[PDB]
Design a protein around this nucleic acid. Sequence first.
DNA 1: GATTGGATAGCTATTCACGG
DNA 2: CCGTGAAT
DNA 3: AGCTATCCAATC
Lengths: 779, 779
Amino acid sequence: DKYTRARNAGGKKAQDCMLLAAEGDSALSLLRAGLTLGKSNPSGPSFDFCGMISLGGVIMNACKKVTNITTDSGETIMVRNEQLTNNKVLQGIVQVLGLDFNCHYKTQEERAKLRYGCIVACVDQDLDGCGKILGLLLAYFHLFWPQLIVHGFVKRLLTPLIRVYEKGNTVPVEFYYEQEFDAWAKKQTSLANHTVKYYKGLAAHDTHEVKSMFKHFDKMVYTFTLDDSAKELFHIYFGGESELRKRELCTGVVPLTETQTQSIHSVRRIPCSLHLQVDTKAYKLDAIERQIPNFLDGMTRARRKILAGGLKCFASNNRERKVFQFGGYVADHMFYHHGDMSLNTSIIKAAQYYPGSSHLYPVFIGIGSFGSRHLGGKDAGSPRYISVQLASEFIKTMFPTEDSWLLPYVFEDGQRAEPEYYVPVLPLAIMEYGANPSEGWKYTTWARQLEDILALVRAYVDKNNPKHELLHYAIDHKITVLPLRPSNYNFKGHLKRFGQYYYSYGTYVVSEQRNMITITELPLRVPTVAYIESIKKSSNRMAFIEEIVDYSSSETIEILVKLKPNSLSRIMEEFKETEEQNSIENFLRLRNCLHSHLNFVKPKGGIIEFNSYYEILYAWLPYRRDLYQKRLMRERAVLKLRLIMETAIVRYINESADLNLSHYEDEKEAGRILSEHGFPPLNQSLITSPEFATIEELNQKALQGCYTYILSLQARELLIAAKTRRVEKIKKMQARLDKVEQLLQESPFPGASVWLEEIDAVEKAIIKGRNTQWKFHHH
Amino acid sequence: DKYTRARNAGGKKAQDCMLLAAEGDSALSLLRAGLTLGKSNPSGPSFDFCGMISLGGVIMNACKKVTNITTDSGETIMVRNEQLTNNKVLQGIVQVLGLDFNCHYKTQEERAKLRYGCIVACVDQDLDGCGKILGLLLAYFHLFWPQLIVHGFVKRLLTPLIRVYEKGNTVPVEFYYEQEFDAWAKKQTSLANHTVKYYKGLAAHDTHEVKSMFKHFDKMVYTFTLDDSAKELFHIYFGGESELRKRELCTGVVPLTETQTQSIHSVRRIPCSLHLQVDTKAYKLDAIERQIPNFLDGMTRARRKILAGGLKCFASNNRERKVFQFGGYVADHMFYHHGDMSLNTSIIKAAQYYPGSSHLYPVFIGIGSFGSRHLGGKDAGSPRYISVQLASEFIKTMFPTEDSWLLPYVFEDGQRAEPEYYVPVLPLAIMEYGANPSEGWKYTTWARQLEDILALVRAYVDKNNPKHELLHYAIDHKITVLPLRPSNYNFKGHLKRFGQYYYSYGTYVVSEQRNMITITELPLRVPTVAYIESIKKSSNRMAFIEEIVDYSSSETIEILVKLKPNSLSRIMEEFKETEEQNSIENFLRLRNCLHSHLNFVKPKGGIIEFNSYYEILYAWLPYRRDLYQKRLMRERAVLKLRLIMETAIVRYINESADLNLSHYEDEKEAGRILSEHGFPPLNQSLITSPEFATIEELNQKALQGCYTYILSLQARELLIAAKTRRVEKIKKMQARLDKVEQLLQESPFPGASVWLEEIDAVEKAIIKGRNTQWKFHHH
DNA sequence: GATTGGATAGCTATTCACGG
DNA sequence: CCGTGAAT
DNA sequence: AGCTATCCAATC
Ligand SMILES: COc1cc(NS(C)(=O)=O)ccc1Nc1c2ccccc2nc2ccccc12
Ligand SMILES: COc1cc(NS(C)(=O)=O)ccc1Nc1c2ccccc2nc2ccccc12
Ligand SMILES: [Mg+2]
Ligand SMILES: [Mg+2]
Ligand SMILES: [Mg+2]
């Protein structure tokens, strides 16, 4: 309860006081600082007429918790959920404002009973603040007291996130959306004399800006208004039907026309339907993009940033670092503008490894406590006391280093960030476990057998496999010719397919001579403590058992169960036996069903729904093949340029004494003399280690050349051994060049043998990691 | 209430159950992993007879919170105050153990009533856990129930601190103290095949390691035993007399002899007196070292680390950074092995600036809110939302950049860290405000007037000042000839010296047409809120006042005292008007006394006590003088070496076409022919950038070198323009060399004029900072 | 009791889907 | 009712 | 994102 009352709140001047609701604590501090500006300006808000309160992060969604029931007289009353009534934030809001769940406030006399004139929401300009928190608050108010919105009881504090200043002019130009900002920027010829400022939340606007904004306080308050359509909109974005969200979120967001925003800014009334259509839709699309993995990479945006930052950090030396320090480094270098605790949790999850864990091939090696098979991995240590390091042996084979220069990249404010997506050697999307929800769709994936995947890919790329010709299709690409069965690496149970569903069964053994029943393997991905709690809550099963206990150490589980005398007969009697599941498995809940929700995010943004793992594999193959071809082409261009440069270098070295470079005056004279002598001008910085640059860029930049590759020659290279090593290197480049030229004309596509070798290397690395419990050089 | 009771604990097997008291959740996880072993370690501890509890706090010193009173029955009883009774950790411990404060437990019958047979402390091996926590626990038990310590009711878990593994062997060796490991390693012939591992606490250990520890569990439990001496020793370390700690902590810790440690490791019993004399004394000495400033530098260890880290970080660019990110950088790069919140608080305190603050000259510019005169500076923002940057001008003028290469340094694991101490141009120890306690001592300093300090230093250095001669002493250097008065920069009150004490007075005015009392200034360093609460607390003062009001701005003080009508008379009558302070000041408490406790830390460890600021200045002067001399000599030597190198380089570049280096085969042939031609062999890397080498190191490593400075020359240098620039550089270096030679011979000591120029520069920087409210290029 | 600095770490609730 | 990851 | 208590000393 962070309420800071107003002096006139609840008194005879209640109908002109204001209540400020802050998204978090930074907004609280900014509001307090602005309010405590008395005696410097008689005009402006102050604590005698304004309130102060905090919402505390995400607020609850009332539209799902409430349930509508009709009465005898046809009245429809909304019963509020037990959890809904016990929420502290909503209770505090309703107590401070003195709202009633029975009065409809249809008349001004009823509106006079509230303790404040109006409620003003102060939230950040980011997607989360404007779309989720404000949207949820609007949904709450619309659901319970729709009439309040009509009479302008709900207002918001609109603050820009972009400010462009021009030196010599004291007033800036403010943009509330990036679209209008960049449209204005591209409209102008040059902004080199200007300066742009972003505001990631209300943790900005230095005291000068705070004073300037609070001077014109009334110019920032915007009143929400209601229309007819908004009703059916509020049900779509916050109702209990996810099908409507699926249909709504399958398309993009249409921005507001100029007339609409002109009316909004001239009158300062915002229709809630427009707010839902723009801000909430944008937030939901961003949430989909953040919480659902890409079908090529298999990882979400946060995990991709983590991997890129880890590669950058541990490229120098693979030394352990604290999770907090590494997360801070990642947030600093990868431009992660969210809370650090979420990043640390994501790192910890990515580094975990145990039977049944989400990652079969984690990209990190964890030093410390990183969860266990029991407790579902939630028993991990704090990020301040555990360390992670790069599993370089597996990474350098799964994500080839030379292919990183060719992926499309994500640019923030003109700076490079983590790539848009990686293209692994083997399809990682269908090679690991995962399960989590998002807006509209849910994602769930059970890993496939490694041997089946290897056989399929080797058939596709081998050109010598007896099944290669039929894997390629001259009829259609829906037929299945090879099995893709669920993996059972760390699983001692069984997997059986019935109809269209795969079921996993744990294994047990029964010693009737003593009346003891012991289970030795639980089904796939079930925590032991959760399983024990589940088997204890069922009183029907609990009746037969005297006691159950465990002696599982850290990775192998066994439960021993002593049940009441002469209970087995009743066990078979009450619990039916079927070919899908026997009496004992039904009794002990040793059967699990593997449901798959193959919903991913396509490279160009958006969602995509698959029907089988074969579709994912067939979609992933062309990207990898094209990446191989592009890599080879750029490699050939680089070799040609490098050969030309090295031949010129050797030619200069041969006759360096004759030239007598010391005789000439300066750089330009020497360059002119060299050009007169026939030395070609190249781009040394673009050829010795080019860039993320592409091939046409390579040619264009190599067109304009300098003579720096001669002037930067150390005297040590002028000896004889250096020249001999240089010509040997030239021979090696020539051999590599004609080898890759031969590789280019290869069937079925260029670089098939390279793919085969990478497959073998990654298979060996995976085997080595499995042998040492995924702790390389630590066994 | 973290507590997992043992199965047998409660009164049936209470005599064999043991309770493990740990530090944090890391120890909890380690102990849980050890105890959960089953069917793989049958002879080992388990939850049948092992307790589990977390302290979850810090232990209060009970010896200071109790009162001993003798009743009429000739019995001395100890009554505990409210805070001791209400402490959560002690209450939990006494409830779990079921201790009685009336039973003396002198026999086995009363001891059997306890819920556990023994209590085992499981703390880290660092100074904190071993010293502070264990000493406080032992003090608690000895104060209340000595017989429990006598009968071995208290034990500790002794875990190895450092372990070295022999490659090819599965058994390492263990050391519990750093000195033992250091002695063994120095005595050991070679350790290339040996792998050392530090265990900072027990949060980091191998699974096989903990498996072995719980395989041999009783080998790591040591019982504490009492003796005759300890009865008084506790009173020295935890009693109410600080003089005993002053007399005890003024010397180093005497290590345990070989016979004592051999007996301890043989019988597994530890005398409590030895533990107090070693671990607690070491911890207290470390606390003194890290909580009291150095009299030369003027800052503590944490502040020195912060300053060095800021200098290293903001060198590339002065762009602002968030406080938490900068703290993470400092912790990473200078090996800060403590919590991040402490570092963030220290940085915030170092960057603060307001009237009456502790830092008249902050080493940081703070963007955001950093507190104000009211609330004493505790109203600053969160470290995640306020930015800091380096005050480049003041730092560069106060701590010269070159001198940083010549200070003694602190080494961690063979790597450099923050300097041992800094030697600023002006003595910063007596130009700031400070007040804080530490073990056995208190530090309190009131800043001196800048003008007096400048005059004193100049008279000591100018050699032309008419006061220079008698400032030096041919009779005795324990006399004062110049004033040293408290500074009044942001002070509009009065300062008056009476006897041996300075007093600060506020300023007040009176108006008789209402009898309005207006306070325009408070004494030095008193927050407004605390003063208001103090004036309200005393009944006899505000009983004559109805109201008090204050419209105080961010930097101004005004208090209006709405007091009773016709009241002045008994204010004069009651509150006595003395020559030291008038009745009105006595009635508003506007007089303060400036007490100074000048206790500092010597450069080579230890504490030192001064009697006046003149002593501090006199001690500080020779260090700066010697540093100036050493800097001048090192620069002279470096200049000579660089002149030789550049002359040789010029000669080569001049006659390079003659030798025709292309003819020779490899590096050795080129070196041989160069030596034959007479080019001297030097250490190019050292002379180009020594950065830490002493004056003798330059000479010793000059002759042993290579011919790298020739073979690393590029073609661009062979041109005429490069040679002309080189010869111009040679001329400039010669001019600087003979200028330095002139500076070397200079009365009274070398480099006096340099000191004068730097004094003028720092004075100008200070004035510029004062004029812009210590916000450079931000006004 | 209060007050100053530099050190000790672990809790506080939700949103989004779709099956148990 | 619970439970997953990524966010306030 | 914030919120939770104590140790040292000497004067108030
Ligand atoms: C409802 O969200 C919060 C409420 C409170 N206090 S209350 C009204 O329930 O008595 C405090 C914090 C939060 N929000 C939380 C977070 C917000 C931002 C970032 C991390 C957060 N982590 C939280 C963890 C547990 C509970 C609330 C958190
Ligand atoms: C659980 O919190 C604490 C645990 C300990 N454990 S131990 C054996 O090292 O003494 C010690 C102290 C705390 N409490 C802490 C705080 C309590 C109140 C207010 C602020 C606190 N700040 C802390 C900062 C770091 C560590 C513990 C703190
Ligand atoms: Mg935000
Ligand atoms: Mg510790
Ligand atoms: Mg910690």
